């Protein structure tokens, strides 16, 4: 998915 927002290592949304 391209709606992916990553804040940090192993911390992701969508």
């Amino acid at each position, epitope marked *: 998915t*391209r*709606k*992916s*927002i*990553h*804040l*940090g*290592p192993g*911390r*992701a*949304f969508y």
Partner: antibody
Amino acid sequence: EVQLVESGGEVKQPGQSLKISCKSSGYNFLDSWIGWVRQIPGKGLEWIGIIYPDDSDAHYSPSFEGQVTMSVDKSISTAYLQWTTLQASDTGKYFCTRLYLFEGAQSSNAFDLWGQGTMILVSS
Amino acid sequence: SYDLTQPPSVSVSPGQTASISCSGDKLDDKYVSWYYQRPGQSPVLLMYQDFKRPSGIPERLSGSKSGKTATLTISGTQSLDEGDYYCQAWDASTGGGTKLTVLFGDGTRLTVLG
């Protein structure tokens, strides 16, 4: 090319409403988040919001939520920022920007591509 | 919710390496990005995921991290580099339900004394 092209400068009297635009081209508009950042003259960048064109999922800065509204029109690849009622303190330069997904063992995001900025002046 | 702190100004002579720090509460488990803005122009992305350079950004700019502090290093600093630099990360607070936020630093004015 691959760009974000914003609409022109605006001069408004307080209490007027306004809708500024951000036309993407050169990539799939639906599939990356659009951000919006404001910068008052000679100050830093201020987050306003992000919105996902594909479905219009949105997140706002608590500083702007309900003061201003994000939207898109996929039919024309445009993002929009809308005020119902302008105020002196809305004066500033507004940028739209695309969040890029950098992929790999480590995936991240960052705002790679930026509009040229829309200036807004609210004056009587 | 937390805030990113950068020093408001830095001054360097042509050639000296310039260093810009960025601190914040959860920075160590958070990817930091860095942006350049020349006044009157649009921001430019210099650095994402702490240390990775977008295609086109030159090698003399490098990103690093230690504890809650991100740093941007500019070497071979020349006048064209003059302007404002901003760090940015994300915050996700429950507050139930997840509230997303883009965090900017206050920005750092670099002067090169030529």
